[PDB]
Amino acid sequence: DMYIERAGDITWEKDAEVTGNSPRLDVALDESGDFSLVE
């Protein structure tokens, strides 16, 4: 029986690390909920 443990308040941080890009990917989705790229 899988169990959960608490981890924090749901908060935006002022002065948090700003990384990560913004790509435009062409995507599909299968009936089993798996995304795939469409070139």
Binding site: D1, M2, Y3, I4, E5, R6, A7, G8, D9, I10, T11, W12, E13, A16, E17, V18, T19, G20, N21, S22, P23, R24, L25, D26, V27, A28, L29, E31, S32, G33, F35, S36, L37
Partner: protein, 156 residues
């Protein structure tokens, strides 16, 4: 058990030691995770049990104790944060501006922040600390890095 709002770790002992299989969001007495993290199974909190209420393998979403409660949406412009919860590590905000999943049915926000699959279910937030979706369903790109949809459910 614990019904306080916030982010939780989803753990199992059905392997070596205690293993974090994913993450979730407790809000308005409903636990929200990704389907691939629990496969629809019941959860323990304290000696209390959480039973699945709603799920969809195609959305890859599942709610416990009540219907899906999170209705906020990426505005299409503003930066967001992956309030990530990696396995063995403290909760950590990682800020970014979302890119785009383009599909026949419509366009979806995405994030290119790679992390252990055990972070699956970590909540993505807007500037007001509203959950606009969950991290951990997307695609491996040419690079070899992972890009995740901002997966959000529908509130009835």
């Amino acid at each position: 058990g614990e019904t306080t709002d916030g982010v939780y770790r989803v753990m199992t002992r059905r392997l070596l030691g205690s293993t974090q299989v994913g993450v979730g969001v407790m809000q308005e007495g409903v636990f929200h995770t990704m389907w691939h993290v629990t496969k629809g199974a019941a959860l323990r909190s304290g000696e209390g049990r959480l039973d699945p209420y709603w799920g969809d393998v195609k959305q890859d979403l599942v709610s416990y104790c009540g219907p899906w409660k999170l209705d906020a949406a990426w505005d299409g412009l503003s930066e967001v944060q992956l309030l990530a919860v990696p396995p063995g590590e403290r909760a950590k905000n990682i800020q970014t501006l979302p890119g785009i999943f383009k599909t026949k049915d419509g366009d979806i926000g995405a994030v290119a922040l790679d992390y252990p699959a055990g972070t699956s279910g970590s909540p993505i937030l807007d500037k007001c600390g509203r959950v606009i979706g969950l991290y951990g369903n997307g695609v491996v790109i040419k690079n070899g890095s992972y890009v995740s949809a901002i997966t959000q459910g529908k509130r009835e």
